Amino acid sequence: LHKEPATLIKAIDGDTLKVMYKGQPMTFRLLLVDTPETKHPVEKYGPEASAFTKKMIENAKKVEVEFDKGQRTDKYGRGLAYIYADGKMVNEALVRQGLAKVAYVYKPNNTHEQHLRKSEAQAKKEKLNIWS
Ligand SMILES: Cc1cn([C@H]2C[C@H](OP(=O)(O)O)[C@@H](COP(=O)(O)O)O2)c(=O)[nH]c1=O
Numbered sequence: 676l677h678k679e680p681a682t683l684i685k686a687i688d689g690d691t692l693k694v695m696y697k698g699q700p701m702t703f704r705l706l707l708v709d710t711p712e713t714k715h716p717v718e719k720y721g722p723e724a725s726a727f728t729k730k731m732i733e734n735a736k737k738v739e740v741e742f743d744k745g746q747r748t749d750k751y752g753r754g755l756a757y758i759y760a761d762g763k764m765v766n767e768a769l770v771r772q773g774l775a776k777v778a779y780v781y782k783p784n785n786t787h788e789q790h791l792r793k794s795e796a797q798a799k800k801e802k803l804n805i806w807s
């Protein structure tokens with residue numbers, strides 16, 4: 676896998692962003708995580724997860740997207756990636772805070788699954804947010 680540059684257009688919620696990627700606006704969805712819903716007919720921690728992702732990616736110097744080994748988009752046309760803000764993966768950061776659960780684990784896009792599950796296990800042991 677490799678990291679590619681991208682530019683934040685707008686953070687939508689905890690796990691969905693609008694991104695300029697190779698000069699075209701796209702919606703991206705974070706791989707392997709699910710932040711609580713705030714859109715579809717508002718789940719506890721959804722507003723917190725949205726604020727965490729917004730802050731983390733808006734305040735970044737450099738944003739990168741890293742596709743996994745399989746599909747690069749979902750059925751809604753969204754890019755599927757690990758997204759990094761100054762080198763720190765947002766998908767892991769949310770999980771480590773108990774603001775996302777590991778979810779939507781679709782092979783072969785599971786390269787960072789064990790890494791994320793280890794962060795989730797710590798967030799659970801620490802009783803953080805969703806796990807409180
Ligand atoms: C994260 C992810 C979500 N999805 C789909 C599964 C879910 O479809 P359905 O909506 O049909 O259930 C939806 C969950 O995304 P959200 O959590 O943004 O709603 O996005 C993928 O197909 N691939 C992925 O890797």
Ligand SMILES: [Ca+2]
Pocket residue numbers: 690709710711712
């Ligand atoms: Ca979600």
